[model samples]
Target: VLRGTVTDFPGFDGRADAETLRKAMKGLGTDEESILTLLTSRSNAQRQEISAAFKTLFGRDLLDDLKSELTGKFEKLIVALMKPSRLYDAYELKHALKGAGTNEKVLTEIIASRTPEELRAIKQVYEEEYGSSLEDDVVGDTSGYYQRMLVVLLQANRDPDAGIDEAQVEQDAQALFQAGELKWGTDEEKFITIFGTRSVSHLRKVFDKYMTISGFQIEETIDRETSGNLEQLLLAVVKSIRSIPAYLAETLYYAMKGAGTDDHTLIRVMVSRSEIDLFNIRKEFRKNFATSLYSMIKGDTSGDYKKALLLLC
Candidate 1:
C-alpha cells in the first residue's frame, strides 16, 4: 500500500517552504494547518531537505522549533516525516519494547512486512542512531518462535525473486498441513521455514493448497495450534504475507479500538503508510470498521493532532 504521490520536486523551492514554516511558528497564533500543508503532503525527503534550508537560513534547528511550538501528535507527525524512515521506526520499536508490556502488533506489522533491503537498512540505522541492533534491543524481551521469526526476517531470509514451483507448492502445502493439523504435535520449525522464506506468489499458492488439503485456512490453523505472542506473530505473518496494507488496517484499528487511543500505534501506522498505500489502507479501514477513517480520526482525537492525521488520510 505504498502511495505514488511523492515527487523529488516539492514546490521547487525549499526556502519558500522554510519561510512558510517560519511564519507558522513565529506568529502570535499557530498556523498548524499551514505547517501541515507544507510538511505532510510532501515526501519525507523533501521535508528533511526543506528542514535543512530552514536551519541554514534561520540559524536554528527546525525540529527544535517544531518541538518548542507543537505538543503531542502534531509535533510527532512532523518529526516522523523529517527523520529518516529507519531512524523514525527504530525509535518507535525501541520504545515499544522498553515498557513491561510490549506492543506486539506494532512490532509484528513492522517486522513481518518489511523486506530484506529496507529491513536491513532499518537494522543499520537502529544501531547507528540508538547504539544497538534492533534485534539485540528487542529480542531479549521476546522469546522462542516469536524471536526466531523476527530474526529470520531481519537477517533477510525471504527470497524476493524465487520463481514459483507448483509441484513444490503442493509439497510445501502438505508439509505445512502435516506440520500443523495433519500431525499430532505442531512442527513450528516447518511452519516458520515456509512462511519466512518463500516468495509471496508461492506462499499464496501454498496457503491455497493448505486450505484444500486441511479444509481450513492457514490462519485458522495458526489460531488453533499456537498461543500467546507466537499466535499473534504467526497470524501477523500470514496477514502481512497476504496484504500488508490490510494487515496494518487491523493494527491501526486495534490502536484506536477502546478507551484511550494508542498514540504511538496510530501515529506509527499513519506516518509509515502515508507515502505508501495509505489510501488503500483507508479502503480496508472503512471496510473493516464500517466508517470512514477520517471520521474515526476526528472522533478519537482533537486539535492539531486530529488535523495532522486527517491530512495524512
Candidate 2:
C-alpha cells in the first residue's frame, strides 16, 4: 500500500550526493511555494529516503532543516513526513505530560484515531528508543477515561487475524456471565481482558453467541449492572472491540464540530489514521454521516491544515 518513487543516484548508499541533494534543497529553499510543493506532498517512505539523502549530503537532519526553514502548519506537515517511528515518539511525548499541563487533545486524538497495528508498532518503537514501556508511562501520567484508553491501547495485544477458539470463547463467555449476569455487578478486569485481548472477528461472533445464550446484548447487561465512569469505560471497550474505524470516525466528527475547529485533532487524526485505514474510515464516514471526510474537514478547517489533509486523501 506504500507508494513512492526512489531514484538510484548511482554509487550513493548511506552518503547522499551532496551536489544533487543540494540542488534539491535549493529547489526546496526557493519559495514558500517550492517547499510546499516538494515536501508536503511526498509519501512517508519518500520523505524518509529524501531525509537520509539530505543528511548524508548536508550533514543535517531534514526535520531540523524544516524546523529552521519553515513555520506554522507548513512545518508540521514536513516534520510529520520524516519517519513514522519518530512521529509516534513525538506524539507520545506530547501526551506524557502530567498535571494540568497535560494535552488531552493529543491523548484523545491519538487513542481515538490509531488502528491496533499502528499502535502496536508505536509502542514497540517507544520502548526500543526510550528503554521504557509506553504503558507504564501512560499509567504514570494520566487518569480517568484518558488513562483507561491509553492503558488499553498500550497493552498492544490484539488477535490480528480475528480468529477465535470456540472453547476459549465458551470459557470467556462463562467468565463474562459470572462477572456481569451471575452477580450483582460486573467485574471490570474480566470485561477488559476478554474484550481487549480478542480479535474483532472473534469478539463479533462471541457477542452474537452471548446474546443468543444470555437473551440480551452485552450493552444491555452493562447498563443494568454497571454505573458511572466504570460504565463508560466498559462501553468504550465494547465499542472499540466492535469496530475501531467506526468509533474513530464518530470521534473525528465530534472533534471537528463540538467547538471551534480543533486543528490538533484534525491534523493528528488524519495524519495518524491515513496509513492504517483512511480508505475504510473515508467509506464509513460517508456512509454514517452522508458526506465525505474530505468535505467535512474542508468545511471545518482551512489554509495549510485543510491543504495537508486534502492532499493525503
Candidate 3:
C-alpha cells in the first residue's frame, strides 16, 4: 500500500551514524555530500534514532549541529527530512496560519490529503507545540464556507471503513445535486458535510451516482458552483477521494510546471511523500505529465538541493 521511495537502511546502527555525522562536521567545512547521503538514505524513524544517539554522544542536538553547518535551501531540505512526519506537518500548518496572510493552498493541500488517523496526530502535535488548537486557529484565520469545511475536517471524525449504503449514497448524490446543481441558490453546508465526513469509499460511490444523475463529473459541478478558497478545498477533497496519487501528481506538476518552481510546495511534497507515497506520486506524475518525476527534478533544480532531491526521488 505504501508506494514509497525510501526504505529502512539495512545494517543500520544509530550510534555509528551519529559518529559518522559528527566526524563529517567535526572540523572546518561541512561535508554536505556525506551528510546528505547518510540522512536521505535513512528512514525517518532511523533519523530520529540517530538524533538521539548524537545527543547522547556529543551533548548537542543533531539538528542544531546540522543547522550551524549547512546553509540555504539545502539546509531547509535537511531540516524537513529530520522532523517527524506529523511534526513537520504541524510546523507547516502553523506557518500557513501564523503570518499576516494565510497560505490557503498549503492548508487545503495538507488537510484534505491526510488520512483521518494522520489528521488526529497532526492535530495533537499542533496543540502540543503551538499552545493553540489548530481548529481554533483555522476558524479565526479563515471565514465563510471554507472555514466551515475546514472545521469538519479538523474534527478528525470521518469514518475509516464504513460499509457503503447504496440508498444513502443515492440520497447523498441527490442531496449534492439539489444543493448545487438543481437549486436556485447553493446550500454550501450539504456539500461540505457530505464531502468532509463521508468515508472515501462511500464518497466514491456517491460521485459515481452523482455523475449518472447530473450528467457531469462532481469535479465539473464543483468548478461551476464554488469559487475561491472554498472551491479549491472542495476540489482537493474530491480529487483525493478519487485517487490520492493522482491528486498528488497534479500538485507536484503545478509546483514545478511554469516559469518559476514553487519551491515550498516542491519541497513539501517531495519531503512529506518521500517515504510515504513518493513512488506512486512519481508514477502518476510520469503518466500524467509525459515525463518522469526524476527527469523533471533533474531539469528544474540545481546544486546540492537538486542532488539531495534526486537521491530521494
Best-fitting candidate, scored by TM-score: 3
lDDT for each residue of candidate 3 in 208-274, tens digit (9 for 90 to 100): 9989998988788667333488888888999999888889888888888879888889899999998
Give the TM-score of each candidate. 0.88, 0.71, 0.93
Better of 1 and 2 by lDDT: 1
Model 2 segments beyond 4 Å from truth?
1-30, 85-90, 97-120, 143-155, 158-186, 209-236
Provide the lDDT at 308 for model 3: 96
Per-model lDDT = 0.78, 0.61, 0.89
Q: Which stretches of candidate 1 lie over 4 Å from their true place?
A: 4-10, 27-29, 98-102, 182-185, 224-227, 287-289
Over 1-313, each residue of candidate 2 has an lDDT whose tens digit, in order, gives 4221222234433333333435545644524455554544554555567677777667877667667766776567556655563455445554545455566445544553456766777777767877777777667776664476457756666677645788877877777766767431446566666766677777777777778778887777666322444454555556656666676676678667756866555565566565567677677778988988888888887665567667666
The TM-score between candidate 1 and the true structure equals: 0.88
**Angstrom error at residue 79, model 1:** 2.5
The TM-score obtained by model 3 is: 0.93
All candidates: CA RMSD (Å): 2.9, 5.7, 2.2
- Backbone clashes in model 1, listed as residue pairs: 1-276, 1-277, 2-276, 2-277, 3-276
Best by lDDT: 3
What lDDT, from 0 to 1, does candidate 2 have? 0.61
